[PDB]
């Protein structure tokens, strides 16, 4: 009667009661890291590259405009629906990174320090993770729900709103998590997947840099650049913070995208993709699953643009062609080029990721688009085909860390807040841009031979150190970020921060319709397309709580 319906208990799971336990607390912090390598999928790389197709760095690529149609629409800024499955996707996905970081914190809050000497260091790790999610989430959507109450009960999540805080108070909440991390993270983390203190400082400084170009008006246009914020970018990129955790610029530019040089001194914080590791095919970077070129039979997404390729040209003395670079294509015999081109972009006639036996061609063997999306290939996230680190599951994936913060990113974030403060520190932004620039100048290991073999002419020199105008120094900073971080999916995000998106990519739309048919119907709509729409399924379920962005 009663002995009978209590006998059958659940198998192979841990229950709501038990997961609190201290025995499991460190399982939850790992599980919370895991989802960064195991929660994305081929259309939702926590690289946000699917969504960086909007930019002038690249096209989506693939079979054609119906191979991922919702991402075409983002690429031309026409046709985007708020129902679109992809936007609901990334929105749901990043909030489930958060639940892991939050469940860990709900258990870690109950721990006692005298018997768990790490307690706070572990809380900081989890909080850092939590900011990473909100940050990217904020980048995608602007008007996001802050989930920072780890002891909040399930039914409390319907009474949440993405307008509880204001667009700046929302940015400050992301900083509150990164700030805490700075205070309590170790100086050096020996378990390299855990962020160290300089990583929290880096992401914190990144958060302020995005918080300072303010949009306190009701639309997405800029309402000034907050002085007090930029002064916090410089604080938490102080060379002394970074030197305590040993980070710096790699000797040769290419190391940040090779698997032998994983976890370098420029890898400030990086997702630890792994192989031969207990899992089914391995914790490979499935997110880049589609960007492998046709030479593996699929799929040919994430193709760099003729805009970006020409962006690597330089003039007689080795400086970019700010005005004219994009008026005739790069031709290797006669133009001067930044080495960084042959680290970012695998072009026809050249080796595929430094393997002189895979030569790339305007061919069924490399591009899937029959010419539509061009014939360029992304090199950063792809690897040598003979790598021990590549493996075909359902797509071709590898063990190559995605670096969330390259140390070059902190030097350019520092040089940026310097140039915006305009307080006579401009000669230091230039020294910063010059570090990034003359490393690139001599990043010819793995491509040393490219002159005699192909006639390429590397010319890249650092800028003379005068007291540049705020704006004239700005374009040299903007150009350095364009060539340093090509195809790493934080380009379009650069522009929406600057309030420049509608202008440069609508201009990219018409220069690049010559090179890529798809951009012929394209139109970026000011105060609308700077941000993905908040997903309609979320809005409609919140009962008027959640609020759309200006434009829909």
């Amino acid at each position: 009667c009663d002995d009978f319906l209590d006998r059958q208990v659940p198998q192979g799971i841990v229950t709501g009661d038990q997961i609190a336990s201290p025995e499991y607390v460190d399982n939850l912090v790992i599980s919370a890291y895991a989802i960064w390598a195991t929660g994305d999928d081929i259309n939702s790389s926590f690289s946000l590259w699917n969504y960086d197709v909007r930019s002038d760095d690249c096209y989506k690529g693939g079979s054609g405009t119906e191979d991922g149609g919702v991402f075409n629409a983002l690429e031309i800024s026409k046709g985007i629906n708020t129902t679109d499955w992809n936007i609901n996707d990334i929105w749901k996905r990043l909030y489930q990174c958060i639940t892991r970081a939050n469940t860990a914190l709900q258990s870690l809050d109950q721990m006692d320090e005298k018997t768990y000497p790490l307690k706070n260091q572990r809380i900081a790790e989890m909080r850092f993770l939590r900011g990473h999610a909100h940050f990217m989430l904020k980048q995608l959507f602007k008007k996001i729900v802050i989930v920072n109450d780890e002891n909040m009960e399930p039914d409390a999540y319907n009474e949440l709103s993405n307008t509880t805080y204001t667009n700046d108070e929302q940015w400050q909440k992301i900083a509150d998590d990164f700030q805490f991390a700075y205070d309590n993270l170790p100086e050096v983390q020996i378990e390299k997947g855990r962020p160290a203190q300089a990583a929290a400082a880096a992401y914190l400084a990144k958060t302020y840099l995005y918080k300072a170009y303010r949009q306190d008006g009701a639309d997405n246009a800029l309402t000034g650049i907050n002085e007090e914020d930029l002064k916090q970018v410089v604080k938490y990129t102080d060379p002394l913070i970074m030197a305590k955790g040993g980070y710096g610029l790699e000797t040769d530019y290419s190391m940040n995208f090779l698997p032998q040089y994983e976890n370098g001194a420029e890898s400030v914080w990086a997702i630890q993709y792994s192989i031969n590791d207990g899992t089914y095919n391995g914790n490979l970077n499935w997110g880049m699953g589609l960007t492998t070129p046709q030479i593996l039979g699929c799929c040919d997404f994430h193709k760099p643009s003729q805009n970006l390729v020409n962006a690597f040209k330089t003039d007689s003395q080795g400086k970019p062609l700010f005005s004219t670079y994009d008026n005739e294509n790069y031709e290797v015999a006669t133009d001067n080029v930044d080495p960084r081109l042959f680290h970012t972009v695998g072009m026809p006639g050249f080796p595929y990721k430094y393997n002189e036996g895979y030569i790339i061609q305007k061919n069924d063997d490399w591009s899937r688009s029959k010419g539509l999306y061009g014939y360029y290939v992304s090199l950063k996230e792809n690897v040598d085909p003979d790598c021990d680190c590549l493996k075909k599951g359902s797509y071709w994936a590898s063990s190559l860390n995605h670096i969330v913060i390259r140390y070059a990113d902190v030097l350019l974030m520092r040089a940026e807040a310097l140039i915006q403060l305009n307080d006579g520190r401009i000669t230091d932004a230039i020294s910063l841009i010059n570090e990034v620039r003359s490393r690139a100048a001599g990043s010819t290991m793995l491509i040393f031979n490219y002159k005699e073999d192909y006639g390429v002419n590397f010319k890249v020199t650092p800028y003379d150190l005068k007291a540049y105008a705020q704006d004239e120094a700005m374009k040299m900073l903007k150009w350095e970020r364009r060539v340093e971080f090509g195809m790493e999916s934080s380009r379009f995000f650069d522009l929406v921060r600057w309030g420049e998106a509608k202008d440069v990519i609508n201009a990219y739309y018409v220069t690049e319709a010559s090179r890529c048919s798809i951009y012929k119907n394209a139109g970026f709509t000011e105060n609308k397309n700077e941000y993905l729409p908040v997903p309609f399924e979320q809005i409609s379920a919140s009962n008027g709580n959640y609020t759309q962005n200006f434009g829909w």
């Binding site: 229950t15 399982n27 079979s63 639940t99 999540y157 089914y280 499935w286």
Partner: protein, 921 residues
């Protein structure tokens, strides 16, 4: 049950479709009972009683020889069935078990009769041919089409990196017209794939053979009886490398001890079924791959795409490579009982049933390499094992009493149920020999993975039910249940489900002395509630699983807890943890279907012209519902909750005419026609915007039929540029494209322009059996129809646009050879284009079609060698017959596919031609 709502089945007609599955024969035989199945050789179906009862499981409950089971019928011997009644309202079914909500099918197997030693041998053999051959472009049509789509866009039609070279120009009006065309001998630059013109549906299909043999033996003494059935079935499906077989044995027996007081008996069936099944989505692959791809390469190998052809695989390869993935299934089923009669009218009997199945299989991964369609060189094997061990025990007391005027029966008792499942599996990679002989787990060189879990549930159920009849004139019945369940916490375990029913046999009221033309006429009315607990064995709980990452996952997103926290790059075991799979609900209770049913029976001249009609109001409340989480809740926010409700009203009518004619011919009719409306009343808010049950997540399904859908409206196609400019501003519209309606007249076509465009319900379904019997010869036809049903065509995306598909250059149906252009303006089909700029894939009225039909589900013709000739062979029964199943279909002119009963991608329903006999001593 004389007060219920009970469709009875003529089990004789059942075998005249030669189905393996008895339920597949009942298709359309019973009003209100929608039986639905594809053409696959196991005959497996799904039953739906009275619309769509609830939001979780709608599968009915079978009670075979007193034992419950919710699965099978296609796993058992349909040939040793003797009785089948479907019980449709809450009252008649409510007492047969704790799971009646979705209807209750009583099934009674054969057994020996007092004083008889009969024996029957039945034996059949059929051929099955592919009916619904979907017409897809050949290598030259695919050439004409691609030229059109290329020019319609004004780019050079020779810029195809395929083997095509064109010869074209402009006519008088300056329109693109095509003259001739030339094609390469080889599809790729290295000349390793010949260009071909294959008919992939001719290739992947064969002529199936079906085959059945049953042997029944009986024996009946006064002190007990016994039965013994033997039987085999073998169906080679119409898809190559798919088959099914069943071996079956049943032994039933009873013993009458201690005069005829103490009785002891047992039913028991034994079954080994075995199958290799069609792979997931081969029909869609066969639609997609161009004719130009050859079955085989220049060398021996299988053909695939090379150079510039689409990302689609070899359908003859996949069907071969999967030819060895055979499960084999052993299901023991039966009961045992004791029955005591301490004094006349009072019986104490208790049954004990056993339903145990095990299912072994080895699934083989071989390396493939058709064209650019690689696998690397993966080899692996997975040895899966599964167990379901169900058992039931009950005990029953019954006193019947006839006062003199009156009659009355009483029953009380209790029932116990416990399913205990498990399943485990060993997977290993790398094999130096790729045969099922070498490919065992000890022969592996590579990595392995282990998998396996278990679960179960126990059921307790106290019940009573009581009857009465004044004097064959006025009939009452009442039932009261108290059902508990393992799935719920202590605070909601047991609910209480009472039911009432009435009946008035108006003909025995000799106030109808007069009317002689009318033998019976009976008015009955039901009200009852039936509990539903058919939910996850883990619904109550908050589920944290450790999920390392060890399982296959597509495109990523394994949601694994393991992570290289050390930066190792792996090589060794990683630290891991726990993810959340769900969130608890302490307060889940039963869901309750309440069914109210009214009906009348009747019987007219000589008891020819018989039938019955019924009207129900079926309502499920406190519906148990897998309630999606809120977005910001994130991972594993699903939880079970009793939020939701749904109703189901309708009419069920069966009516048949018997009579002989004086010239030897006998003719017997048996039609039936149902209808019903289904509406969702309430629903939690996440389930609403989920669209899970209807809204496509644009609108909410509350107020509409379960599965209703929302989309745009296809006002034809733009025919000239001024219909575009005067239309609402619509992104990507031009002369050629589909015009979409402006439903809020805001002057722009955006996503707000969608309304309810699909309702899956039929405006009435029906079926009719005709029997003719003239001078030994017997002929039977069973028709079945469904008029009113809407149908969402996903094939139309492949037959009406060069680019309503995610990847370029797929094969496309034949229809687009008839698309619009300047040159051909008498067509609905929008002009070919290479790019879907008008998003013609969006949910349109374009894809909603009249899927109504009437099929000749079966036709049979036989001869019965008269007893004079057969009985010198010393035989009671000698009959030869021959049948056709699904021989012919009739459908709407505005339906573009082949089989409207299966428009898209499921296993084609084939046409069977059958031969057989019935020896019977």
């Amino acid at each position: 049950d004389l007060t219920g709502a009970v469709s009875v089945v003529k089990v004789d007609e059942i075998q005249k479709q030669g189905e393996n599955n008895p339920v597949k024969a009942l298709q359309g035989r019973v009003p209100g009972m929608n039986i639905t199945a594809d053409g696959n050789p196991s005959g497996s179906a799904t039953v739906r009683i009275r619309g769509i009862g609830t939001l979780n499981n709608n599968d009915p409950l079978y009670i075979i020889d007193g034992v419950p089971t919710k699965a099978g019928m296609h796993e058992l011997n349909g040939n040793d069935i003797e009785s089948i009644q479907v019980l449709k309202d809450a009252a008649s079914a409510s007492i047969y078990g704790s799971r009646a909500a979705n209807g209750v099918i009583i099934i009674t197997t054969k057994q020996g009769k007092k004083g008889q030693i009969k024996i029957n041998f039945d034996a059949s053999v059929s051929a099955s041919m592919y009916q619904s051959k979907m017409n897809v472009l050949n290598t030259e049509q695919y050439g004409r089409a691609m030229w059109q789509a290329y020019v319609n866009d004004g780019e050079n039609p020779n810029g195809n990196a395929l083997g095509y070279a064109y010869n074209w120009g402009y006519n008088a009006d300056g329109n693109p017209v095509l003259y001739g065309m030339t094609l390469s001998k080889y599809l790729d630059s290295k000349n390793t794939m010949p260009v071909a013109d294959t008919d992939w549906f001719d290739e992947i299909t064969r002529t199936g053979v079906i085959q059945q043999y049953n042997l029944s033996v009986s024996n009946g003494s006064e002190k007990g009886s016994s039965f013994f059935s033997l039987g085999y079935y073998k169906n080679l499906g119409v898809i190559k490398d798919t088959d099914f077989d069943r071996f079956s044995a049943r032994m039933n027996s009873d013993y009458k001890l201690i005069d005829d007081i103490l009785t002891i008996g047992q039913h028991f069936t034994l079954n080994r079924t075995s199958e290799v099944q069609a792979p997931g989505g081969i029909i869609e692959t066969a639609l997609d791959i161009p004719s130009a791809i050859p079955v085989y390469a220049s060398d021996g190998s299988w053909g695939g795409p090379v150079g510039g052809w689409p990302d689609r695989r070899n359908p003859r390869a996949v069907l071969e490579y999967n030819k060895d993935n055979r499960y084999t299934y052993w299901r023991m089923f039966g009961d045992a009982y004791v029955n005591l009669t301490p004094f006349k009218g009072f019986n104490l009997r208790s049954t004990f049933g056993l339903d145990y199945a095990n299912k072994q299989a080895r699934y083989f991964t071989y390396p493939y390499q058709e064209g650019t369609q690689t696998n690397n060189g993966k080899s692996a094997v997975e040895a899966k094992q599964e167990h379901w061990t169900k058992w039931m025990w009950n005990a029953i007391a019954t006193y019947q009493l006839e006062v003199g005027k009156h009659r009355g029966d009483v029953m009380i008792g209790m029932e116990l149920n416990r399913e205990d499942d498990s399943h485990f599996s060993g997977y290993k990679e790398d094999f130096s020999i790729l045969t099922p002989d070498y490919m065992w787990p000890d022969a592996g060189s590579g990595t392995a993975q282990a998998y396996g879990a278990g679960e179960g549930y126990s059921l307790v159920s106290f019940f009573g039910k009581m009857n009465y009849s004044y004097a064959d004139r006025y009939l009452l019945s009442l039932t009261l249940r108290r059902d508990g369940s393992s799935r719920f916490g202590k605070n909601h375990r047991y609910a209480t489900f009472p039911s009432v029913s009435l009946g008035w046999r108006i003909t025995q009221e000799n106030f109808m002395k007069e009317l002689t033309w009318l033998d019976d006429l009976k008015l009955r009315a039901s009200w009852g509630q039936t509990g539903n607990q058919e939910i996850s064995n883990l619904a109550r709980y908050t589920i944290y699983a450790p999920n390392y990452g060890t399982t296959d996952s597509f495109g990523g997103q394994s949601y694994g807890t393991a992570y290289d926290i050390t930066g190792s790059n792996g090589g060794g075991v990683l630290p891991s943890g726990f993810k959340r799979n769900q969130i608890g609900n302490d307060n889940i209770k039963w869901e309750t279907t309440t069914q109210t049913n009214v009906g009348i029976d009747f019987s007219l001249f000589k008891q020819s012209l018989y039938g019955s009609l019924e009207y129900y109001y079926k309502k499920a409340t406190d519906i148990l519902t897998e309630m999606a989480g809120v977005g910001v809740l994130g991972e594993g926010g699903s939880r079970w909750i009793n939020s939701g409700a749904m109703k189901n009203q309708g009419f069920e009518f069966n009516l048949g005419y018997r009579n002989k004619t004086a010239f030897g011919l006998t003719y017997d009719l048996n039609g039936n026609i149902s209808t019903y409306r289904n509406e969702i009343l309430e629903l939690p808010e996440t389930v609403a915007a989920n669209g899970k049950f209807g809204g496509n997540g644009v609108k909410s399904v509350v107020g509409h039929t379960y599965g209703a859908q929302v989309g745009y409206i296809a006002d034809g196609i733009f025919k000239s540029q001024d219909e575009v400019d005067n239309h609402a501003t619509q992104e990507g519209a031009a002369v050629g494209r589909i015009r979409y309606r402006d439903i809020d007249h805001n002057g722009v076509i955006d996503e707000r322009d969608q309304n309810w465009i699909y309702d899956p319900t039929p405006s009435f379904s029906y079926g009719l059996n005709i029997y003719l019997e003239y001078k030994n010869f017997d002929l039977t036809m069973f028709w079945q129809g469904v008029q009113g049903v809407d149908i969402i065509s996903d094939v139309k995306k492949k037959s009406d646009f060069w680019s309503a598909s995610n990847v370029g250059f797929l094969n496309k149906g034949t229809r687009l050879l008839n698309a619009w252009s300047p040159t051909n303006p008498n067509s609905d089909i929008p002009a070919l284009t290479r790019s879907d700029t008008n998003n013609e894939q969006r949910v349109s009225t374009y894809f909603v079609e009249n899927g109504s039909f009437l099929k000749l589900r079966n036709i049979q013709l036989g001869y019965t060698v008269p007893a004079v000739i057969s009985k010198k062979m010393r035989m009671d029964r000698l009959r030869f017959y021959c049948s056709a199943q699904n021989l012919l279909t009739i459908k709407s002119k505005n339906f573009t596919g082949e089989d409207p009963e299966n428009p898209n991608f499921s296993y084609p329903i084939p046409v069977n031609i059958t031969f057989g006999l019935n020896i019977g001593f």
